[PDB]
Design a protein around this nucleic acid. Sequence first.
RNA 1: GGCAAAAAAAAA
RNA 2: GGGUUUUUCCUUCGAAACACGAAGGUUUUUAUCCCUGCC
Lengths: 215, 225
Amino acid sequence: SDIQMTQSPSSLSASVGDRVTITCRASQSVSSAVAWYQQKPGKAPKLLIYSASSLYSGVPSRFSGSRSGTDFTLTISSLQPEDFATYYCQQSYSFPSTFGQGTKVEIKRTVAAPSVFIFPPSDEQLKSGTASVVCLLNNFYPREAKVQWKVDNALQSGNSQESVTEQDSKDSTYSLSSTLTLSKADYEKHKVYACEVTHQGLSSPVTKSFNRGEC
Amino acid sequence: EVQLVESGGGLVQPGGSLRLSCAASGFYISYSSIHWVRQAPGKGLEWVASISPYSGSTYYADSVKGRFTISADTSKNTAYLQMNSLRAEDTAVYYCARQGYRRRSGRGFDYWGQGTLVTVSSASTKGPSVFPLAPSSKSTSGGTAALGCLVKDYFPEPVTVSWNSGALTSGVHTFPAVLQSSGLYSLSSVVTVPSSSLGTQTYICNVNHKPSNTKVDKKVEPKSC
RNA sequence: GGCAAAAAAAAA
RNA sequence: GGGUUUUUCCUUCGAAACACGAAGGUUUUUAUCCCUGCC
């Protein structure tokens, strides 16, 4: 008889000033012993709603819960940038306690073009023989943006790793790092290393690069 | 004023044992229920155990008893979690949480520590080699330009990096480490600054990897004019 | 009408 | 039906999910207890 909490939806995205609603269904009766938590990336959850509908002291008025039998919602009346988070519902009606599987709320904002940078490999890293060309897209939106590498204009494949920050607490933008892992042998082999990106803040792809040793 | 502090996690080998501690300050653990709630990398939260006051009665999740055991030493206002028979599925951030006062918050968890990461792996710890990535000046870069430190080949997580020892925090972006095909982690942390002020100031990053026990600070400069 | 007695154990 | 004597159950409270404690609640199982004398 382990109660299961079924949270709806997994991910959603609304603009600022939007009204957004999260739902959880208890597999069986959990009375009203349900809490809601906000968890921002990297730090610990924070209690928003306890006892299914009561607002924990300090939380803004815009977060609210309520219950229809086994159907529990958390509505946030006017989405705000600070509210980008992952939200978890919890039943504490019986042991063991169970969390929902979570809802990752992002934020919709105006298209922001990435500011693109290229950094050559510094050679404490070619002091020990391999190469770290890296690309940077600073503060842009939306997330979905593709970045292509070339090396004397040669399309690259299977030697790229990308990592993108979480969405910002205050302006909602992203940023992304694409890094190409290749030899020292392949780094004096060719001369220039191009990074280009096709994101919809770009008329058509902006490109940045460098020579080897021309600074 | 209330505060909980987890410690004692880290890297352990499969089958190994670990004791987590939870140091409470600003309130007495005897008068509340204390819970351990765990979170895997990128997954959701999983309740693990808790002990209740006066009784001292304990309760466990099915994925963890026979193996985990929760206790509290009230004279050190500290709650522990003894972990034997550890397995890869036990790799997670472990939180210790206080259940709030009934009248004030029902059964909700009103205070959480910041979690201690437990890494169950057969792998051995390696510290990173931090490489700077240098700004682009033309002769000065008219407005703002970017620079950052590459942190490569380390295990396990985490590292922490700080520019001018915490002095510089605006425009920082420490990217989530990604795992190379090598089985080591590597991340980048970048900050943006006015090029106007590029040559008059020095840009330092304090990477730190307590698993390795490596503390390195490398400092960034342009190249030659 | 008015006093007095009496008497073991389970469950929601 | 009305009771006695025992348990449970439920609700509010005690820093309080169980355990312990305080104050409460209106129900019904017993061929497994009593419903008898006196002006």
